[PDB]
From a paper:
Recently, Ups1, a yeast member of the conserved mitochondrial intermembrane space (IMS) proteins, was shown to mediate PA transfer between the mitochondrial OM and IM in cooperation with Mdm35. Mdm35, another conserved yeast IMS protein, is a binding partner of Ups proteins, and facilitate their import into mitochondria. Surprisingly, two distinct polypeptides of Ups1 and Mdm35 form a single compact domain, the Ups1 part of which corresponds to the START (StAR-related lipid-transfer) domain, likely functioning as a lipid-binding domain. Like other START domain-containing proteins, the Ups1–Mdm35 complex contains a deep pocket that can accommodate a lipid molecule and an Ω-loop likely functioning as a lid for the pocket.
Numbering used by the authors: -2 to 66
Amino acid sequence: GPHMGNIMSASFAPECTDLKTKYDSCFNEWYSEKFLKGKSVENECSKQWYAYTTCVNAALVKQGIKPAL
Ligand SMILES: [Co+2]
């Protein structure tokens, strides 16, 4: 069934939770279309992936646990 989100990650970067939900949903929809239905479709979710990933990276850098440059 559905695999829940990470509580520690959400607690560390709550401002990224909605972006994560949107990315996970996009990816699941894409995977269903291509690998469950076997339909040759465009790659998807690059934008949703970027939004979430950048949000997480920004949080790590802001808290001083990831270098900026
Ligand atoms: Co499952």
